Enzyme design. Structure first.
Site, short mmCIF file in Angstrom:
data_model
loop_
_atom_site.label_atom_id
_atom_site.label_comp_id
_atom_site.label_asym_id
_atom_site.label_seq_id
_atom_site.Cartn_x
_atom_site.Cartn_y
_atom_site.Cartn_z
CG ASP A 145 37.58 27.88 73.85
OD1 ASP A 145 36.43 28.58 74.73
OD2 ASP A 145 38.62 28.42 73.84
NE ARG A 149 38.04 32.15 75.88
CZ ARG A 149 36.72 31.73 76.29
NH1 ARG A 149 36.09 32.40 76.84
NH2 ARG A 149 36.48 30.72 76.14
CG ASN A 150 38.34 31.20 71.01
OD1 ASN A 150 39.40 31.72 71.00
ND2 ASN A 150 38.00 30.23 71.60
CG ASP A 163 39.68 26.95 69.34
OD1 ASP A 163 40.45 27.49 70.07
OD2 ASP A 163 39.05 25.82 69.25
C1 LIG Z 1 44.52 41.25 64.61
O1 LIG Z 1 44.19 40.30 63.58
C2 LIG Z 1 44.69 39.01 64.02
C3 LIG Z 1 44.96 38.48 65.40
C4 LIG Z 1 45.05 37.43 65.74
C5 LIG Z 1 44.97 36.40 64.80
N1 LIG Z 1 45.43 34.94 65.12
N2 LIG Z 1 45.82 34.73 66.27
C6 LIG Z 1 45.97 33.39 66.69
C7 LIG Z 1 45.22 32.96 65.47
C8 LIG Z 1 44.88 31.45 65.09
O2 LIG Z 1 45.27 30.41 65.82
N3 LIG Z 1 44.23 31.28 64.05
C9 LIG Z 1 43.94 30.07 63.53
C10 LIG Z 1 42.80 29.59 64.22
O3 LIG Z 1 41.58 30.19 64.61
N4 LIG Z 1 42.41 28.05 64.04
C11 LIG Z 1 41.32 27.33 64.36
C12 LIG Z 1 40.14 27.41 63.93
C13 LIG Z 1 38.84 26.93 63.91
C14 LIG Z 1 37.88 27.49 63.58
F1 LIG Z 1 36.91 27.91 64.57
F2 LIG Z 1 37.71 28.27 62.51
F3 LIG Z 1 37.05 26.48 63.15
C15 LIG Z 1 39.16 25.77 64.71
C16 LIG Z 1 40.35 25.24 65.11
C17 LIG Z 1 41.42 25.97 64.96
CL1 LIG Z 1 42.82 25.42 65.54
C18 LIG Z 1 43.74 32.40 63.02
N5 LIG Z 1 44.02 33.64 63.40
C19 LIG Z 1 44.84 33.83 64.46
C20 LIG Z 1 44.85 36.47 63.42
C21 LIG Z 1 44.32 37.98 63.20
#
Ligand SMILES: COc1ccc(-n2ncc3c(=O)n(CC(=O)Nc4cc(C(F)(F)F)ccc4Cl)cnc32)cc1
Length: 290
Positions: A145, A149-150, A163
């Site tokens: 994904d 947005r990610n 993600d």
């Molecule tokens: C304004 O500042 C903010 C705002 C929002 C956030 N925020 N909100 C939600 C999440 C969140 O879920 N994560 C974990 C993540 O990204 N997980 C992941 C990564 C990868 C890879 F792409 F890195 F590889 C793969 C798989 C997963 Cl599950 C982090 N930040 C989040 C943080 C700061």
């Protein structure tokens, strides 16, 4: 499970920033996290509801993935529900909102000039996201994904890849909901992903290709003029996204590198990062004539 733990007492929730359906996000003050700063601001994801296991898998994974251009994970607070994951706070939020708000259809603050971002600003962003993808392909980790947005943008326009589950809520229109559980980012997926359901490094460079297009369109939805079924038909029929106005032909060629119909014809992400870094660090005199 070599995950850093943080004491509940060292985390002070300030207010909410975002809601998904598996998690809420909060601004929080966090104490004793860095010696450099006795106190500092973080984003904290609270688990909503299996769920604990997913949380343990997510935390183990994010303790593994560390890099300049992957979202920085500090660790968990497992001492009482709600279970918390603690992340770096990214002042400009998600790169899609950041693009849209610095695009012709939107002023100049601390990190950025007023008006459209410059070509050099957009190569810098693209470079950083590519740098992130190298590090994942490095680890033979398939993202599945990749989209603006990610990614998140920090102070100094530092861009990092994540993600986020909240992406399926905030940006539901970027997903095709199949059956009634699963959600497919069809506009970002190559034909082998839509047709055969194969997900690879090479399906990620396709997605990076579309990220490049989002950057140069200041965050427009790819195939915005199409329904989900029209986008599927058009992506399986090999139809390619148009060069955005702000996209020099030389950048459009990198995008085409990522959109070769045959997974194996696609340029590696290392190659693409190299092409993009080189442009972003090229002198204005070279860029003003691109
Ligand atoms: C304004 O500042 C903010 C705002 C929002 C956030 N925020 N909100 C939600 C999440 C969140 O879920 N994560 C974990 C993540 O990204 N997980 C992941 C990564 C990868 C890879 F792409 F890195 F590889 C793969 C798989 C997963 Cl599950 C982090 N930040 C989040 C943080 C700061």
């Amino acid at each position: 499970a070599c995950v850093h733990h943080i004491k509940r007492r060292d985390i002070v929730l300030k207010w909410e920033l975002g809601e998904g359906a598996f998690g809420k996000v909060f601004l929080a003050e966090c104490h004793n996290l860095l010696p450099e700063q006795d106190k500092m601001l973080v984003a904290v994801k609270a688990l909503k509801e299996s769920a604990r296991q997913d949380f343990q898998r997510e935390a183990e994974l994010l303790t593994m993935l560390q890099h300049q251009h992957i979202v920085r994970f500090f660790g968990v607070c497992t001492e009482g529900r709600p279970l918390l994951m603690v992340f770096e706070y990214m002042r400009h939020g998600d790169l899609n909102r950041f693009l849209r708000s610095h695009g012709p259809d939107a002023a100049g603050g601390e990190d950025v000039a007023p008006g459209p971002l410059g070509l050099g600003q957009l190569l810098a962003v693209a470079s950083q996201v590519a740098a992130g993808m190298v590090y994942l392909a490095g680890l033979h980790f398939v993202h599945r994904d990749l989209a603006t947005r990610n990614c998140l943008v920090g102070q100094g326009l530092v861009v990092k890849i994540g993600d986020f589950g909240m992406s399926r809520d905030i940006y539901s229109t970027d997903y095709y909901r199949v059956g009634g559980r699963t959600m497919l980012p069809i506009r970002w997926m190559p034909p082998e992903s839509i047709l055969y359901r194969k997900f690879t490094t090479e399906s990620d460079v396709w997605s990076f290709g579309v990220v490049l297009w989002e950057i140069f369109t200041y965050g427009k939805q790819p195939w915005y003029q199409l329904s989900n079924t029209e986008a599927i038909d058009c992506i399986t029929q090999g139809r390619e996204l148009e060069r955005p106005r702000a996209c020099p032909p030389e950048v459009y060629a990198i995008m085409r590198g990522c959109w070769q119909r045959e997974p194996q014809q696609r340029h590696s992400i290392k190659d693409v990062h190299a092409r993009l870094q080189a442009l972003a660090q090229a002198p204005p005199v070279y860029l003003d004539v691109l």
